[PDB]
Amino acid sequence: LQRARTILEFEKMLPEWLRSRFRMGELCKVADEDFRLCLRINEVKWTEWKTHVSFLNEDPGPIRR
Amino acid sequence: AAKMGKAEILKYILSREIKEKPLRSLSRKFTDWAYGPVSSSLYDLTNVDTTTDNSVLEIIVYNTNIDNRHEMLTLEPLHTLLHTKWKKFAKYMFFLSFCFYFFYNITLTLVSYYR
Amino acid sequence: AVLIAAGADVNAHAKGVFFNPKYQHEGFYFGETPLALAACTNQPEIVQLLMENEQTDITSQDSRGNNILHALVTVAEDFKTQNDFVKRMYDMILLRSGNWELETMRNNDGLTPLQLAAKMGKAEILKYILSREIKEKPLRSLSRKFTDWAYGPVSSSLYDLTNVDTTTDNSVLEIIVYNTNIDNRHEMLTLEPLHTLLHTKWKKFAKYMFFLSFCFYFFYNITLTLVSYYRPREDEDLPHPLALTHKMSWLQLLGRMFVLIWATCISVKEGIAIFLLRPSDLQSILSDAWFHFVFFVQAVLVILSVFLYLFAYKEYLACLVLAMALGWANMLAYTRGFQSMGMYSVMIQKVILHDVLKFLFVYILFLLGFGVALASLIEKCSKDKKDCSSYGSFSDAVLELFKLTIGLGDLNIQQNSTYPILFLFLLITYVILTFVLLLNMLIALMGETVENVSKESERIWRLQRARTILEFEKMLPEWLRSRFRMGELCKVADEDFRLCLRINEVKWTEWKTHVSFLNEDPGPIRR
Amino acid sequence: IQKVILHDVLKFLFVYILFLLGFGVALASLIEKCSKDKKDCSSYGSFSDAVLELFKLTIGLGDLNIQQNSTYPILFLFLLITYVILTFVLLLNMLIALMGETVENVSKESERIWR
């Protein structure tokens, strides 16, 4: 919490144009018009062995190219 | 949910997996790809970090009156994003102010002891 | 199955940008064949179906020289984050079709999949595979366990012992002792081929062999003491770092030619040992290569005294004493041979490393912070005893405050001058900090640590005596007269009357009739 | 009083006397110096002095001398502070933490032993 208490204050005393792009930006949603909302990528492990209905892509690890 | 500090429904709502396709669009989780046991998880990130005023991160850090804040930040939009943002600049930025104050500290010592 | 009925190729190799390291990326390194992920998907039914095809090759190495068994190991991560299916998956694929040719297959870097379980540190499947009881008689021959006799509740247990001890290069014992990067090694050596065999080999020679080197270094240590304390002092500034006495009663010439050789012999001994591992500069140099680094610093520091006669420098006696103080300081390393004291040897080893570095990094900070500040008021034009020729500059108030930890004598609130009720204010603040607050921290800090470690601290000591025992054998190139084992005791296989074995004892469980046995149940061998 | 003498302090003194001799002989080398103690022509300054000089360091000794002992006393004081680093803040506080684990382990069955 205390290092979290610090880190925002540095950003608060950073009025630049925010070059530190901390995120995947404007990565498209499933909604056909809503291709907005910057996102995140994370990793999960072995549980709940099943078929997966919902997906977004043709399963690469990073983005293509 | 941040202001009241209700953790468990906040534990829910940041995930919010929607399985059904006609209304999957409202979720806070989208399986970007899965490939079985090791998946590409994905949080929605729309009102989380201070890109707008008074984002949910800005409350939970700068809130009093709650002794669940340390436990609440365990959550995975909350936890890893701090580690993310500390990596690229804030590990550097602290050590600058650390060195600037420590070398401030030495210049204080010399002029007030030697002559 | 319809695709197989359509005629899909069961032998395909999925190359590409996956099977990458850094498991944050995809890198899911299963072995690129349809058989490999099939067990890995926890799908035993189609595993059977893949075995129904005669065209299925299983032998075939794929990308990193890996067959079915290799990457099979490198998903065995935990008992908690797994239902433990891989164990019976692996068991199923052996009984369905299993040959020793497939087992003895090595890989790209030339490494046994059994040895891979050591390298990856997958403990639980390694817990399986060393036992490997096979109950059925047409293929019992491939087991790692053979009931030599049983007689009910107290049986003659027997491990296979074929790739275990260093009778060949890079045996599975040699990995697990000399491996870094894994914090499961101490727990893994609990296993019964691993555990008892060390106790076996320590019995016949290594209990003797340590005490030889212990006595040789301890009596080295005494000869260091005598020549450097009793008669270095002759009234002349000739250095003479080793006492000679070229006349009769040759005790001191015996002193010189003793000490130089053992220092040289221990230098080459540890010099090859330091050539031999590469740490990440703080994990194994600061648990394992510590006392090795101690020795290498020690012996060179001894022989450097000999170099101080060459141009006769000023350091001839000053350097001659540091090796002495350190030379008794590493007898601490050689007390591991006892039972309870070896348990204390890890208690001295982690508290230096987790607790007191944390202490001194804060302790020296206020030692300077109060140190310079009190050195400002101590000037005063009145420093110490009519301060015109005496001391009163910086190291005084350092040592005035350094002695405050212990009995200093008396504390002076005396003539130091401008506002001494600020001077005494910092003195009592130092007492508030550094005697009642900051010191009693570490005492409460140690108590939490010592109970946390001393449930597994025994095992760490076991690793360190295991760390020793192989090195003695490594510095034993004899014909290995110490026969540590039952040798070439015959297997059930009619031609394979080979594979040196072991005898062990089990107790009351699982009350049943025993089908498989070897003999007509004597206790020892007949005659 | 009966098990702590037997499981804990034998372990202590077998290590304690080791550095008591190790520092003991080493500091006895520098204390010769042709300048041992108070114009060293008739007074003492041989071996048991620096033993008792260092044996009194466990408790209040009076004052500690960084004085005229001669050749490189910043090695002499270096061993003194190393003795403090070892034998007052590291090695002593071992047994205190060691006793606390033992006393709770025995005092659930310690009554029975008295019986």
Element (H, E) at C504: strand C504-505
What distance in Å separates residue A46's CA from the closest CA in chain C?
Answer: 7
- Tell me the C-alpha to C-alpha distance, in Å, between residue C178 and each of C119, C172, C476: 10, 10, 18
With CB atoms and an 8 Å threshold, state whether C18 touches A49: no
Question: What are the strands, taking DSSP E only, across C90-222?
Answer: 156-157
What distance in Å separates residue B37's CA from the closest CA in chain A?
Answer: 5
CB contacts, 8 Å: A61 with chain C: 17-18, 20, 25-27
Q: Are C44 and C65 in contact (CB under 8 A)?
A: no
- Tell me the C-alpha to C-alpha distance, in Å, between residue C86 and each of C36, C125, C142: 11, 8, 19
Q: How many other C-beta atoms are found inside a 10 Å radius of the C-beta of residue B87?
A: 12
Mutate to test the interface with A, among B17, B29, B33, B48 (most CBs of A within 10 A): B33
Q: How many Å is the Cα radius of gyration of chain C?
A: 33
DSSP string covering C302-323: HHHHHHTTTS--TTTTTSTTHH
Q: How far apart are CA C353 and CA C351, in angstroms?
A: 5
Closest Cβ–Cβ partner in A43, A46, A62 for C82 = A46
- Tell me the C-alpha to C-alpha distance, in Å, between residue A29 and each of A39, C68, C490: 9, 40, 68
User: In terms of CA atoms, which chain C residue is nearest residue D100?
Assistant: C447
3-state secondary structure of C358: helix
Residue type, B104: Y
- What is the signed CA dihedral for B80, B86, B87, B88, rounded to 10 degrees? 120
Q: Are C11 and C60 in contact (CB under 8 A)?
A: yes
3-state secondary structure of C156: strand
Q: Which residue's entry shows tokens 């050195």?
A: C375
What distance in Å separates residue C375's CA from the closest CA in chain A?
Answer: 34
Q: How many Å is the Cα radius of gyration of chain D?
A: 19
Q: Which residue's entry shows tokens 């469980």?
A: C509
Sequence-separated (6 or more) residues with CB below 8 Å from residue C142: C94, C98, C100, C132, C134
Record the tokens describing residue C298, joined without a space: 């020690």
Structure determined via: cryo-EM
User: In terms of CA atoms, which chain C residue is nearest residue D82?
Assistant: C325
Phi, psi of C145 (to 5 degrees): -145, 135
Sequence-separated (6 or more) residues with CB below 8 Å from residue A9: none
Q: How far apart are CA D37 and CA A64, in angstroms?
A: 82
DSSP string covering C111-148: --HHHHHHHHT-HHHHHHHTT-B---GGGGGG-SB--S
Phi, psi of B44 (to 5 degrees): -80, -40
CB contacts, 8 Å: C375 with chain B: 113
- Give the residue from C347, C332, C342 showing the smallest Cα distance to C214: C332
Q: Are C499 and C491 in contact (CB under 8 A)?
A: yes
CB contacts, 8 Å: C23 with chain B: 38
Resolution in A: 5.2
User: Percent helix, strand, coil in chain A (nearest 5)?
Assistant: 15, 5, 75
What distance in Å separates residue B113's CA from the closest CA in chain C?
Answer: 6
With CB atoms and an 8 Å threshold, state whether C331 touches D18: yes
Q: How many other C-beta atoms are found inside a 10 Å radius of the C-beta of residue B44?
A: 20
What distance in Å separates residue C25's CA from the closest CA in chain A?
Answer: 6
Q: Can you name the residues that pair with A42 across neighbouring β-strands?
A: B41
With CB atoms and an 8 Å threshold, state whether C450 touches D98: yes
Number of alpha carbons in the 13 Å side-chain half-sphere of residue C507: 0
Residue A52 at interface with chain C, using a CB cutoff of 8 Å: no
What is the CA C95 to chain-centroid distance, rounded?
37
Q: How far apart are CA D30 and CA D74, in angstroms?
A: 11
Element (H, E) at C86: helix C86-96
User: In terms of CA atoms, which chain A residue is nearest residue B35?
Assistant: A59
DSSP string covering B21-70: GGGGGG-SB--SB--SSS-EE-B--SSSSTTSTT-HHHHHHS--S-S-HH
What distance in Å separates residue C375's CA from the closest CA in chain B?
Answer: 8
Q: How far apart are CA C121 and CA D6, in angstroms?
A: 39
Q: What is the largest CA-CA distance in chain D?
A: 63
- Tell me the C-alpha to C-alpha distance, in Å, between residue C16 and each of B39, C28, C323: 18, 11, 58
Q: How far apart are CA A25 and CA A38, in angstroms?
A: 4
Q: How far apart are CA C448 and CA C445, in angstroms?
A: 6
Instruction: Tell the burial category of B42 from Cβ atoms under 10 Å away from its Cβ (0-12, 13-18, 19+).
Output: buried
Tally C–D CB contacts below 8 A: 100
- Give the residue from C420, C410, C424, C411 showing the smallest Cα distance to C382: C420
DSSP string covering C233-300: --SS----SS----SSS-SHHHHHHHHHHHHHHHHHHHHHHTTS----SSSSTTTTSHHHHHHHHHHH
Q: How far apart are CA C155 and CA C153, in angstroms?
A: 6
Closest Cβ–Cβ partner in C18, C23, C81 for A46 = C81
Q: Are B25 and A30 in contact (CB under 8 A)?
A: yes
Record the tokens describing residue C263, joined without a space: 């220092």
Residue C369 annotated as part of some ligand binding site: no
Chains interfacing with A (3 or more CB pairs < 8 Å): B, C
CB contacts, 8 Å: D101 with chain C: 447, 450-451, 454
- Tell me the C-alpha to C-alpha distance, in Å, between residue C189 and each of C123, C175, C193, C337: 10, 12, 9, 18
Record the tokens describing residue C215, joined without a space: 């006595």
Q: Are C102 and C94 in contact (CB under 8 A)?
A: no
Closest Cβ–Cβ partner in C23, C28, C376 for B112 = C376
Q: Which residue's entry shows tokens 């707008």?
A: B52
Phi, psi of C501 (to 5 degrees): -130, -165
What is the CA D45 to chain-centroid distance, rounded?
19
Record the tokens describing residue C24, joined without a space: 């944050």
Q: How far apart are CA C314 and CA D46, in angstroms?
A: 23
Handedness of CA C472, C476, C482, C484 (dihedral sign): positive
Q: How far apart are CA C387 and CA D95, in angstroms?
A: 45
CB contacts, 8 Å: B38 with chain C: 23, 26, 28
Using the CB atoms, write b or e for C313-335: b if 16+ within 10 Å: eeebbbbbbbbbbbbbbbbbbbb
Closest Cβ–Cβ partner in D59, D84, D90 for C407 = D59
Alpha-helix runs per DSSP H in chain D: 4-7, 9-30, 47-55, 73-87, 92-106, 110-114
Record the tokens describing residue D7, joined without a space: 């499981």
- Give the residue from D1, D2, D7, D19 showing the smallest Cα distance to D95: D7
Asked whether at least 3 C-beta pairs link D and C within 8 Å, the reply is yes
Q: Which of the 8 DSSP states describes residue C494?
A: S
Handedness of CA B71, B77, B79, B81 (dihedral sign): negative
- Tell me the C-alpha to C-alpha distance, in Å, between residue C338 and each of C189, C222, C346, D11: 19, 22, 13, 11
Record the tokens describing residue C448, joined without a space: 């939490």
Q: Can you name the residues that pair with C156 across neighbouring β-strands?
A: C149, C505
With CB atoms and an 8 Å threshold, state whether A61 touches C25: yes
Q: Are B6 and B75 in contact (CB under 8 A)?
A: no
3-state secondary structure of B17: strand
- Give the residue from B34, B26, B19, B29 showing the smallest Cα distance to B77: B29
- The residue length of chain B stands at 115
Q: Are C121 and C184 in contact (CB under 8 A)?
A: yes
CB contacts, 8 Å: B20 with chain A: none
Record the tokens describing residue C497, joined without a space: 């009357």
Q: Are C489 and C500 in contact (CB under 8 A)?
A: yes
Element (H, E) at C505: strand C504-505
Q: Chain B window 74-113: which residues touch A at a Cβ cutoff of 8 Å?
A: 76-77, 80-82, 84-86, 88-90, 93-94
